Design a protein around this nucleic acid. Sequence first.
DNA 1: ACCA
Lengths: 336, 5
Amino acid sequence: PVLNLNDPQAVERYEEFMRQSPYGQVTQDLGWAKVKNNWEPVDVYLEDDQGAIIAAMSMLLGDTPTDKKFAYASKGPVMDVTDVDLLDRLVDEAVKALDGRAYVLRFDPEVAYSDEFNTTLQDHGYVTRNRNVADAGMHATIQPRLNMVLDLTKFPDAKTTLDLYPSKTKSKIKRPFRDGVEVHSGNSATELDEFFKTYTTMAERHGITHRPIEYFQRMQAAFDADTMRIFVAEREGKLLSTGIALKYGRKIWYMYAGSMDGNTYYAPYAVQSEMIQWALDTNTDLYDLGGIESESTDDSLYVFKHVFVKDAPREYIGEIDKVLDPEVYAELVKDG
Amino acid sequence: AXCXX
DNA sequence: ACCA
């Protein structure tokens, strides 16, 4: 069925499935459509024989240089996507709801790449984008396919962040705190302003592009402090580093961050230690530090995140494209 | 454009 | 140095 966003009871039923599913993703929450307020939401789901929701897909529709929309279910759908017969049924419902308006429906679930799964998706008619476009780098796909994920279930008795690490890394994590760095957290306008100052400073330092503050205001309006939390590191009243973490489903996700210019006393490691502590204190399975370009010491993202993730990065299946208008698809998408 | 999110 |  298609979700009527004007029906609060249907919306709450959809949200309860989303929030309680082990496959849940913050970017599949209906709150994500409020963040992406320049996109058009279309949401579908499937029910079992008892009428309970068993699978859902939150889509956002964007404009293109053509007469067709781009339909995108970020880190969706919420179900076991390796159950491809069920996936086909959910995608068919999504395709009906799109009503010919989109050239593609793309979804990029956090499921491991494998040859067998890639082959099955292609057998079912999907076009997949993963190792065949890897040469284009991290931004070959919309979300990074290679991600640095800390599996806290490997440490069932850990009480604090330090319990997860070898002694050499314990020392790296202790160092900001020994040098006076203190971290507070919250989801108020105060912490948002602190984050935004460090975020814009980081972006200008790297010469990269950055989102306006209203993007994060919409995030803060959509998600309460048990879901979205901003961690702020200071040393003696001086703002040093921040990060935004989102808790949803089986993971806490380090999503946005920044540091001031100058001496920051390893404050970013203190921010990581406290987000990891939040994951431990809430019995969350996974702590996701997010994307890297490659598993290489040449990659500054890998070097930083490897301090906290000694396991190999997770490599996901990438983008799964249900091609709807193949002429426009070939115009707008190259297969590597 | 750049980390998604 | 980057620690996004």
